[PDB]
Amino acid sequence: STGSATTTPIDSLDDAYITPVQIGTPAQTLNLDFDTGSSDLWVFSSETTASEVDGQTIYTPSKSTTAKLLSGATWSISYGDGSSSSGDVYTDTVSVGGLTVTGQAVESAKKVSSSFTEDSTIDGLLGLAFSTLNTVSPTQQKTFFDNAKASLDSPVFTADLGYHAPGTYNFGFIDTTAYTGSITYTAVSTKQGFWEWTSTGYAVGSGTFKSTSIDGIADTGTTLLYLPATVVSAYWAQVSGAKSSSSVGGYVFPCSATLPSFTFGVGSARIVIPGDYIDFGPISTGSSSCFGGIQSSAGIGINIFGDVALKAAFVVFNGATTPTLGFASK
Numbered sequence: 110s111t112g113s114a115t116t117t118p119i120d121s122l123d124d125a126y127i128t129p130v131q132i133g134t135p136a137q138t139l140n141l142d143f144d145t146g147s148s149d150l151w152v153f154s155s156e157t158t159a160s161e162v163d164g165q166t167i168y169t170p171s172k173s174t175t176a177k178l179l180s181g182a183t184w185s186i187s188y189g190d191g192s193s194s195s196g197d198v199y200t201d202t203v204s205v206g207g208l209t210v211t212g213q214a215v216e217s218a219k220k221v222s223s224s225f226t227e228d229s230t231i232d233g234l235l236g237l238a239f240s241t242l243n244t245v246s247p248t249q250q251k252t253f254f255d256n257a258k259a260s261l262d263s264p265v266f267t268a269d270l271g272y273h274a275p276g277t278y279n280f281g282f283i284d285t286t287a288y289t290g291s292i293t294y295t296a297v298s299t300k301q302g303f304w305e306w307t308s309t310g311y312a313v314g315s316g317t318f319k320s321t322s323i324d325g326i327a328d329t330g331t332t333l334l335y336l337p338a339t340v341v342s343a344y345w346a347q348v349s350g351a352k353s354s355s356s357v358g359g360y361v362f363p364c365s366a367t368l369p370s371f372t373f374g375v376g377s378a379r380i381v382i383p384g385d386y387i388d389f390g391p392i393s394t395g396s397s398s399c400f401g402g403i404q405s406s407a408g409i410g411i412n413i414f415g416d417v418a419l420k421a422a423f424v425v426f427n428g429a430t431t432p433t434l435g436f437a438s439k
């Protein structure tokens with residue numbers, strides 16, 4: 110079995126990507142945020158507090174002939190940005206681009222935090238990290254990828270995110286036409302439940318490459334690139350007028366400046382992120398200060414290779430017995 114689906118940016122800044130998912134019988138299509146930094150499949154539903162729903166498409170388990178309430182099961186999640194959601198759990202049929210999983214745990218949101226209610230284009234999340242992170246109590250549940258793995262031609266999924274344009278999420282196969290050159294594979298550590306790997310270094314613009322180990326996670330659910338203070342300072346020192354702002358909460362730069370590119374190492378291979386991908390536009394409408402896409406991970410505790418880095422490459426998440434990450438230039 111294989112599955113193929115288009116992922117579309119939610120706004121002109123590429124803040125998040127939505128992918129249509131079919132849930133239940135007859136199918137109810139919801140636009141979900143595919144997140145490799147979490148492991149819960151949760152949706153806005155007929156059970157979510159009415160005041161916390163503003164334009165999202167909801168899942169209605171009562172209208173699904175295949176929906177089963179998982180008796181006594183509850184879930185509760187908290188993300189790195191201080192956002193959260195919780196509720197009860199159902200089992201139902203879930204399909205992504207023609208790939209079907211029966212008996213998938215679908216977490217029905219009863220309470221969602223403000224950042225979710227405010228984001229009317231996102232109907233929920235589809236976690237693609239390892240299942241040890243799933244928050245279903247008292248019986249932990251498997252992710253969509255874990256449930257589909259037996260049926261897949263190859264136990265892999267690929268992320269090919271577009272820059273201001275649509276992209277693709279493929280399951281069960283590698284599209285040899287979606288990248289150039291060869292794929293460089295790197296080791297994954299699953300100890301924290303994430304797709305965790307080690308970058309071999311970096312370069313700023315046309316500068317010399319610095320060989321230094323950078324441990325971080327491949328996260329499609331995070332918009333920006335979060336790197337150690339030293340690395341981030343070295344990058345913004347090359348942008349005239351750039352400074353770190355406590356009021357804004359990170360590095361800002363004059364909107365009229367040209368941003369240098371950022372290179373990260375994958376083994377002996379290099380991935381170049383064009384400077385244009387690092388521009389996140391004005392901090393406020395009309396402002397001449399622009400927000401940077403490369404920020405410090407000092408307050409996070411973990412380095413995150415978010416959408417800013419991933420959209421610059423073809424990314425293979427090899428979920429074989431010993432997991433690996435593949436990167437290729439596109």
Ligand SMILES: Nc1ccc(F)cn1
Pocket residue numbers: 144145146147188189190192328330331
């Ligand atoms: N990995 C993440 C980070 C934030 C969020 F809202 C969802 N997923």
